[PDB]
């Protein structure tokens, strides 16, 4: 449905039929997320990870009421052109879930 990223990425999403949105700071990204959940944006709402480290922070208000939306971080256009250490994010996920580092 809707993704919030750089305007070039948003233009590509429009080219693919997705409702791309432009943003360059946390405040307008949070406002777009709020207006999407308020208007009932269906299911997935991806956010640029270099824009918001955790989209769930703007969902702490609304998460209790609904379970349909799925929000996840993803690299932007120029961000994806440089190496992304997804393994560190997974290690952080495991350390949050269990409480200890799990790999070396």
């Amino acid at each position: 449905m809707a993704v919030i990223a750089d305007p070039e990425t948003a233009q590509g999403f429009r080219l693919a039929g997705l409702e791309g949105y432009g943003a360059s700071s946390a405040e307008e990204a949070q406002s777009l997320l709020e207006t999407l959940v308020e208007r009932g944006g269906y299911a997935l709402v991806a956010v640029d990870e270099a824009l918001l480290p955790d989209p769930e922070r703007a969902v702490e208000r609304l998460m209790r009421g609904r379970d349909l939306p799925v929000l996840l971080p993803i690299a932007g256009l120029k961000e994806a052109f440089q190496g992304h250490d997804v393994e560190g994010y997974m290690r952080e996920l495991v350390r949050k879930t269990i409480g200890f580092d799990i790999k070396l």
Partner: protein
Amino acid sequence: PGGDMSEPVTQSTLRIVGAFWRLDASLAFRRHFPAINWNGSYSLFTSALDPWYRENVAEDYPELRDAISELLQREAGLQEIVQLVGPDALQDAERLVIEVGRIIREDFLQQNAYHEVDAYCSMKKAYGIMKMILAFYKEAEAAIKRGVSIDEILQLPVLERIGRARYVSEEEFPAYFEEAMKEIQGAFKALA
């Protein structure tokens, strides 16, 4: 009757004895003898006996004993994670601690009573084994700090020499101890 330590006879006995050696059937089940549980056991004579150990065994014997006890305590402190997520999910330092505890359990605490030479062990042989184990631990920790892998460390040949130490005769022990002490530093430093 029933194995409860709160029974009045055991409570009265433990208030006047100087040492308590907790035999455990769980250790005996997994073929670990003489099967004394080192977690529950204790002794109140060590402080009064330390000068004799210094004069008749070695000046640093209490320090090695304390280091071995600390290693066992730390290894026991990791028992939760090694059982929850498995051994391979640990880091290199934690796996090294676990393997050092395994080496200690299998080569120093364990003792075969029916063997011809392993049935009896003097203080000097125990001191030598403890010093060999501690030297290997320090060298392995330094190697881990220098980027060596734990899997590579656990394949060294000097581990066999450490394992067979408790089966060496009493009179031939000092030469074996010196050679193994040299080999422990040789296996690491010569490889770099």
